[PDB]
Symmetry: C3
């Protein structure tokens, strides 16, 4: 126990984070359901194209999920909670469309893939700007103090 909590500075980030977990659960579910429909038994990860695209979509979302996370949280703490959470949401909605697109074809994944990438770059930029705002003043000051002597 302390007599204050910082929950209330990260609750939006936490909500978006959870939403991302749930979205991954939906993607796994679709993979399970593709495994049944095209009869691809674990441990195999190859099969008909229609299976491979679903499986790949899920794998690519899972692999980007930690990156999404890390940049969400850095942006949301160093830049602005609300703005990070919102880019997060745009990221997740884009990945849902990416997943749906890819299921249909390689080509129909592209537009939402690009939109996923833009939303993730926005998170990167907000995180970077936030970190710059945190470190740049002291560093400029130290450099000016050095030249002043």
């Amino acid at each position: 126990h302390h007599h204050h909590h910082h929950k209330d500075e990260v609750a939006l980030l936490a909500a978006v984070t959870l939403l991302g977990v749930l979205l991954q659960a939906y993607f796994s579910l679709q993979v399970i359901s593709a495994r049944r429909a095209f009869r691809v038994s674990p441990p195999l990860t190859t099969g008909p194209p229609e299976f491979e695209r679903v499986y790949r979509a899920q794998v690519n979302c899972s692999e980007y999920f930690p990156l999404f996370l890390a940049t969400l949280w850095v942006a949301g703490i160093f830049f602005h909670e609300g703005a990070a959470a919102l880019c997060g949401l745009v990221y997740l909605f884009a990945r849902l469309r990416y997943f749906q697109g890819y299921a249909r074809s390689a080509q129909l994944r592209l537009a939402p893939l690009y939109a996923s990438a833009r939303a993730l770059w926005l998170l990167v930029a907000l995180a970077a700007l936030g970190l710059l705002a945190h470190f740049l003043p002291a560093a400029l000051r130290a450099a000016l103090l050095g030249r002043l002597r």
Copy 2:
């Protein structure tokens, strides 16, 4: 520096996290050892079924690891540290049995897989309840104030 630290509210979550890291290390070690026994040289990922099942078991535990993490932390902060840590432990022990099961066969993976899924779902539910507790009162209040 501040004159207080919040470490002590997250130390169980941190211990469980690290335990999870160590478990992944054990899984990688088994994969390395299966690569030697069945002579599957990187960058190959395919080979005899006994190699593929170990390899897949590891890749599936790696891929769910961040999900475990995220929910572990959200649940532990917004619901209850101890309860989240404990579900976490149950998740990790279930994955260790899943890994061992899968090595032996596709079929023996299933019971511990299901247990691992139940444990993760519990973490999800805790995280969701914790977030509901945080947001719901102010939202109901704002709505009541609007109607007044």
Copy 3:
């Protein structure tokens, strides 16, 4: 809102985290570029060895990213911010060399792979020591108080 922030205790961790995200971006970019040069269209993940090595290097770095993250943060918070950040940087730089090595051959990946593993074990050790320093005193004290009664 609050009248203190803990940003300034984790800014180095956050910066190393973001550097890690950027490095994964660089790795993906090399994968895209290898897909074009060797004509391997998603959803395929197999192709000429030169493509497979790049692709594997990227996958292995993505899969260890969250482990790196988790241990970076636990070490940075329970042991020492600066020392964790520094081992983080050595981890990332080694993975860059691992990636470049692996692109050229299976064999050239090994030295920087071993350096990546050492740097991650150091983070694991710093995390474990920090957790020990947090829990061990109260536990020893409780055990002694029990025997004293």
